[PDB]
């Protein structure tokens, strides 16, 4: 038997995590019990512990919060409580625990496992039979999942919280614009700064205050200088993000009110403070959080099955896009050590302890917020060109912004090419500066413009422009055509010397079909649009009852959107190109759905990637389900279309765009401090790492006929859709 509970602050995605624990549990043939109101429900026992069936967790995954409740329980901190808690579990035969919560909830579970010796006091007291003390003894497997928006310890709810913050910032930006105003926004993260940092990065904030890294003396003047510069630059508003637990090098709090006093005093600007508060914990879970929570739920169940008495309690986690089990005790220690470092004022150590990507976000943030005066930037005599190629993808503008500003910070001269290779061939090229890309981070589309056309038939005109504009390097932000483009330019090197320069691309496309990257800029935005659209369609179906929607999604031959969207939306099926399916597979899902209509959940959702089959079209499927569903359910078909691309990029796509482009520019600058295969590369994400791969080496790994990679990491998740539905 398995008990699942939620403790500490609630986080969006908890319901998904619970959903996945119950369904994976049941699918493996275990019994699963909800424990309501966190530990308190464990202590109180009784109706607070209830067995969960397949039906109990439908309609839950798209909702914020925890449907089974959470609570700070003082009774569990006492020995008396844990004794009663332990007793209640034994009554239900529950020796497997899954705890979803923060630092505190998991330390509580750590403690509970150590003291599972409490069973002896059950023996000494009336409590339990001796057989029980031996039968359930040290047979307490505990697995933890972190669910705090803080990222205190990637955590469930962080992405959702960030969507929340950025929604507020984007809303505030229209009102700050009117006349002129400076806004001071207090965001969550008690003693963690991750949220503030990543929000700042995501909105191009003018200043940020973190607990892990205090400001340093003289910040008051530095900040006011920056704000005066902005007014001189005519920027119609300022945004300053402040972590709840922002502090002095002396550990004194820096409050939002003090920041306001400072700005009004020094500069007399019109200033307002907004404390976002608990809104950050609310709203619907993002696509990322739903998928993350699902993978974690499934992994937590597996960990429990596989656990031995010799194996220590673990926390399931995602490291480098792999499911890992970290010793719970070690993780608890880690969290104390950061606070220790903070208290002792070893602030560099605090940042070190938060991990590689934390320092990455921090350095990248500063680089893009604070421009050294021109005189200070030495300059070197290269011109670096930036371009967009392929369909538009949310996050392209953030990417250009970052590349330009890093380029300028490195003393290059930045050239913007407009309309992809179309504009390139036509000489649509202009210098671009730091100020030009101001405000781009949250802008959807492509401001430079993007086209699909390939360079191959325009090699001479393009070579001319490179010579004409003395172009020393090229950064291409774009999709599969960007990659084909690089291949063409690589091949054209022998006949045109102008292409014997360093060239790199970052992947930007809604489809996520670029070889050399697990992720592409824009796909998270699309997933969020698909997921929201599916939530609605499902509601429509649940209003009518006995209805199945067949929904066509984008992606080309790339199944990423249909598959991940399917998971995030709770679809019953997702047909993709990468997994052949036949009429037997189709009949089988129809029969499954027909069974499902005998239950309470009388809706269905079937996703079909647009190019998944030449014969088994969206209509074909619609017709089969319709005909074989007769008398039990009816269908509707919907082709989502271009609206899936979505609009403004999600916080993930903003920051992906920003970070990955910054990294590409560093590589360009480094190459210029010095032409063959290794100078024409795709900068992609590969399991934990961002890496530069020669386009020549990516050919072997690519299916050119269908424009998808040969190996796609996410196909290992296919079993999850079956299970989770």
Ligand X SMILES: Nc1ncnc2c1ncn2[C@@H]1O[C@H](COP(=O)(O)OP(=O)(O)O)[C@@H](O)[C@H]1O
Ligand Y SMILES: O=P(O)(O)OC[C@H]1O[C@](O)(CO)[C@@H](O)[C@@H]1O
Ligand Z SMILES: O=P(O)(O)OC[C@H]1O[C@](O)(COP(=O)(O)O)[C@@H](O)[C@@H]1O
Q: Detail the residues annotated as belonging to a binding site for ATP.
A: 9, 72-73, 102-105
64 sits near its own copies (criterion: CB under 8 A): yes
559 binding partner (options ligand X, another protein, ligand Z, none; Cβ < 5 to 8 Å by kind)? none
Binding flag, residue 76, ligand X (CB under 6 A) = yes
Binding range to ligand Z, per CB under 6 A, among 44-52, 197-205, 554-562, 684-692: 554-562
C-alpha 406/C-alpha 414 separation (Å) is 10
Q: How many residues bind ligand X (CB under 6 A)?
A: 17
Which residues, in sequence order, are bridge partners of residue 317? 324
Which string of x and - marks every residue 272-311 that binds ligand Y (by CB under 6 A)? x--------x------------------------------
Quick one: tokens of 718?
A: 């296919």
Q: Say whether residue 107 binds ligand X (CB under 6 A).
A: yes
Q: Are the C-beta atoms of residues 609 and 574 closer than 8 Å to each other?
A: yes
* By CB under 6 A, residue 144 contacts ligand X: no
Least separation in angstroms between CB 335 and ligand X: 10
Q: Please tell me what DSSP assigns to residue 116.
A: G
Of the candidate residues 2, 4, 7, 554, the single one contacting ligand X (CB under 6 A): 7
Is residue 594 involved in binding another protein (CB under 8 A)? no
542 binds its own copies (CB under 8 A): yes
Considering only residues 281 through 320, tell me which ones interact with ligand Z, judged by CB under 6 A: none
Nearest to 557 by CA among 575, 582, 583, 581: 575
As a whole number of angstroms, the distance between CA 408 and CA 702 comes to 35
Nearer to ligand Y, 192 or 386 (CB): 192
Helix (H) or strand (E) holding 454: none
524 contact, one of ligand Y, ligand X, its own copies, none, CB 5-8 Å limit per kind: none
Beta bridge partners of 32: 2
SS in 3 state form for 27-67?
HHCCCEEEECCHHHHHHHCHHHEEECCHHHHCCCCCCCCCC
211 binds ligand Y per the rule CB under 6 A = no
Binding to its own copies by residue 637, rule CB under 8 A?
A: yes
Question: How far is it, in rounded angstroms, from Cα 147 to Cα 285?
Answer: 12
Choose the contact partner of 258 out of ligand X, ligand Y, its own copies, none; CB within 5 to 8 A by kind: none
- For every residue of 556-580, DSSP letters joined together read TT-THHHHHHHHHHT-SEEE-TTS-
Strands 32-35 and 49-51: antiparallel
Least spacing, CB of residue 538 vs another protein, in Å:
23
Place of tokens 């409740």: 69
CA atoms within 13 A on the CB side of 459: 17
Task: Find tokens 């997933």 and name the residue.
Answer: 527
Pick between residue 42 and residue 573 the one whose CB is nearest to ligand X. Answer: 42
| Cβ-based nearer residue to ligand Z, 128 or 553 | 553
Q: Identify which range of 59-67, 290-298, 494-502, 658-666 contacts its own copies by CB under 8 A.
A: 59-67
Instruction: Please select the residue that binds another protein; options are 58, 321, 623, 675, rule is CB under 8 A.
Output: 623
Stretch that binds its own copies, among 24-32, 116-124, 367-375, 645-653 (CB under 8 A): 645-653
Q: Among 540, 594, 617, 693, indicate the residue that binds its own copies (CB under 8 A).
A: 540
Asked if 620 interacts with another protein (CB under 8 A), we say yes
User: Which one of ligand Z, another protein, ligand Y, none is in contact with 281 (Cβ closer than 5 to 8 A by kind)?
Assistant: ligand Y
Total interface residues for its own copies by CB under 8 A: 78
Q: How far is the CB of 509 from ligand Z (least distance, A)?
A: 4
Range in contact with another protein (rule: CB under 8 A) among 93-101, 396-404, 419-427, 611-619: 611-619
DSSP 612: S
DSSP code per residue over 261-303: HHHHHHH---EEEEE-GGGGG-SPPPHHHHHHHHHHHHHHHHH
Report the C-alpha gap between 302 and 435 in whole angstroms. 52
Considering only residues 275 through 304, tell me which ones interact with its own copies, judged by CB under 8 A.
275, 277-279, 281-284
Q: Which is nearer to its own copies, 289 or 299 (CB)?
A: 289
By CB under 6 A, tell whether 9 contacts ligand Y. Answer: yes
Q: Could you give the count of Cα atoms lying within 13 Å of 610 in the half-sphere of its Cβ?
A: 15
Greatest alpha-carbon pair distance for the chain in Å reads 92
CB atoms within 10 A of CB 617: 15
Please work out the total of residues on this chain that contact ligand Z, with binding judged by CB under 6 A: 14
Looking at the DSSP bridge assignments, the partners of residue 548 are: 604, 635
Residue placing its CB nearer to ligand X in the complex, 101 or 297: 101
Q: Does 188 bind ligand Y (CB under 6 A)?
A: yes
Q: Does 57 bind its own copies (CB under 8 A)?
A: no
Residue 601 contacts its own copies per CB under 8 A: no
The annotated binding site is made up of 9, 72-73, 102-105, 148-150, 181, 188-190, 244, 272, 278-281, 452, 509-513, 547, 554-556, 610, 636, 642-645, 707
Q: How far apart are CA 587 and CA 566, in angstroms?
A: 19
Q: Does residue 182 belong to the site contacting ligand X (CB under 6 A)?
A: no
Listed in sequence order, the DSSP H helices in 410-473 are 420-425, 459-468
**Given the structure tokens 């090699």, which residue do they identify?**
459
Phi, psi of 356 (to 5 degrees): -60, -50
Q: How far is the CB of 286 from ligand Y (least distance, A)?
A: 17
Say if residues 396 and 477 touch (Cβ distance below 8 Å).
yes
- The minimum distance between CB 513 and ligand Z, in angstroms, equals 6
| Binding letters toward ligand Y, positions 124-153, x by CB under 6 A | ------------------------xxx---
263-274 in b/e form (b: 16+ CB < 10 A) is beeebebebebe
Q: How far is it, in rounded angstroms, from Cα 205 to Cα 226?
A: 11
**Torsion angles phi and psi, residue 558, rounded to 5:** -85, 120
Helices (H), 115-248: 118-124, 130-135, 158-177, 194-203, 219-232
Q: Is 105 in the site for ligand X (CB under 6 A)?
A: yes
Binding to ligand X in span 39-58, by CB under 6 A: 39
CA distance 599 to 633: 13
Site for ligand Z in 482-541 (CB under 6 A): 509-511, 513
| Active-site residue set | 150
Q: Which stretch binds another protein (CB under 8 A): 66-74, 100-108, 561-569, 621-629?
A: 621-629
Q: Is 329 exposed, middle or buried (0-12, 13-18, 19+ CB in 10 A)?
A: middle
**Tally of residues, the chain:** 725
**Is position 264 an interface residue for its own copies (rule: CB under 8 A)?**
no
CB of 687 to its own copies, least distance (A): 30
479 binding ligand Z? (CB under 6 A): yes
- Least distance CB 452 / its own copies (angstroms): 9
Site for another protein in 337-376 (CB under 8 A): none
What is the C-alpha to C-alpha distance for residues 661 and 368, in angstroms, rounded to an integer? 12
Residues that bind ligand Y (CB under 6 A): 8-9, 102, 148-150, 188, 190, 244, 272, 281
Residues that bind another protein (CB under 8 A): 582-583, 613, 615-617, 619-620, 623-624, 626-627
């Amino acid at each position: 038997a398995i008990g699942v509970l939620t403790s500490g602050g609630d986080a969006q995605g908890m319901n998904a995590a619970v959903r996945a624990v119950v369904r994976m549990g049941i699918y493996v043939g275990a019994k699963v019990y909800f424990i309501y109101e966190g530990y308190q429900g464990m202590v109180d026992g009784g109706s607070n512990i209830a067995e969960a069936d397949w039906e109990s967790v439908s309609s839950i995954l798209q909702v914020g919060g925890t449907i089974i409740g959470s609570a700070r329980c003082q009774a569990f901190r006492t020995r008396e409580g844990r004794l009663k808690a332990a007793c209640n579990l034994l009554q239900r035969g529950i020796t497997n625990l899954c705890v979803i919560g923060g630092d505190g909830s998991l330390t509580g579970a750590n403690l509970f496992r150590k003291e599972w010796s409490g069973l002896l006091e059950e023996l000494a007291r009336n409590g339990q039979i001796d057989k029980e003390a031996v039968q359930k003894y040290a047979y307490l497997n505990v697995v933890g999942m972190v669910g705090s928006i803080d990222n205190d310890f990637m955590t469930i709810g962080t992405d959702s919280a960030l969507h929340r913050i950025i929604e507020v910032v984007d809303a505030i930006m229209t009102t700050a614009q009117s006349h002129q105003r400076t806004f001071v926004l207090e965001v969550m993260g008690r003693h963690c700064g991750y949220l503030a940092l990543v929000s700042a990065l995501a909105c191009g904030a003018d200043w940020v205050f973190l607990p892990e890294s205090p400001p340093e003396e003289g910040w008051e003047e530095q900040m006011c200088v920056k704000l005066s510069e902005n007014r001189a630059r005519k920027k119609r508003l300022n945004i300053i993000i402040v972590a709840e637990g922002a502090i002095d090098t002396q550990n004194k709090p820096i409050t939002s009110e003090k920041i306001k006093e400072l700005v009004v005093t020094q500069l007399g600007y019109d200033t307002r403070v907004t404390i976002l508060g608990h809104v950050q914990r609310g709203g619907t879970p993002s696509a990322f959080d739903r998928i993350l929570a699902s993978r974690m739920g499934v992994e937590a169940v597996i960990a429990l099955l596989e656990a031995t008495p010799d194996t220590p309690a673990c926390v399931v986690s995602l490291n480098g896009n792999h499911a890992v089990r970290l010793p719970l005790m070690e993780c608890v220690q880690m969290t104390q050590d950061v606070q220790k470092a903070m208290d002792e004022r070893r602030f560099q150590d605090a940042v070190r302890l938060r991990g590689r990507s934390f320092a990455g976000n921090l350095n990248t943030y500063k680089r893009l917020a604070i421009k050294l005066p021109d005189d200070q930037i030495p300059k070197t005599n290269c011109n670096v060109a930036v371009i967009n190629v392929g369909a538009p993808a949310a996050g392209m503008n953030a990417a250009v912004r970052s590349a330009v500003r890093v380029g300028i910070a490195d003393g290059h001269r930045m050239l913007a090419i407009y309309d992809g290779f179309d504009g390139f061939a036509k000489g649509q090229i202009k210098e671009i500066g730091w100020t030009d890309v101001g405000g781009w981070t949250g802008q959807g589309g492509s401001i430079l413009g993007t086209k699909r056309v390939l360079p191959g038939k325009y090699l001479e005109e393009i070579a001319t422009q490179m010579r004409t504009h003395s172009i020393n390097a090229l950064l291409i932000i774009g999709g599969f055509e960007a990659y084909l483009g690089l291949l063409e330019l690589s091949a054209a090197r022998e006949k045109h010397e102008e292409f014997c320069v360093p060239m790199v691309m970052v992947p930007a496309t809604v489809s996520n079909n670029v070889p050399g990257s697990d992720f592409s800029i824009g796909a998270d935005t699309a997933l969020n649009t698909i997921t929201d659209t599916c939530d609605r369609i499902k509601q429509s179906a649940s209003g009518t009852k006995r209805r199945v929607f067949i929904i066509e999604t984008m992606g080309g031959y790339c199944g990423y959107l249909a598959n991940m969207g399917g998971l995030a939306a709770g679809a019953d099926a997702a047909y993709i190109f990468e997994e052949p399916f036949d009429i037997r597979d189709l009949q089988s899902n129809v029969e499954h759905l027909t069974e499902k209509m005998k239950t309470t959940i009388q809706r269905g959702l079937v996703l079909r990637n647009e190019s998944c089959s030449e014969n088994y079209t969206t209509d074909f499927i619609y017709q089969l389900y319709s005909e074989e569903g007769k008398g039990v359910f009816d269908c509707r078909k919907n082709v989502l279309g271009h609206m899936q691309q979505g609009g403004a990029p999600s916080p993930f796509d903003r920051n992906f765009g920003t970070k990955i482009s910054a990294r590409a520019m560093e590589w360009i600058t480094a190459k210029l401090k010095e032409t063959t295969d290794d100078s024409i590369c795709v900068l992609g994400i590969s399991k934990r790492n961002v890496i530069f791969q020669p386009v020549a080496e990516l050919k072997k790994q690519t299916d050119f006929e269908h424009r998808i990679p040969k190996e796609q990491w996410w196909l290992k998740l296919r079993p999850l859709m079956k299970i989770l539905a």
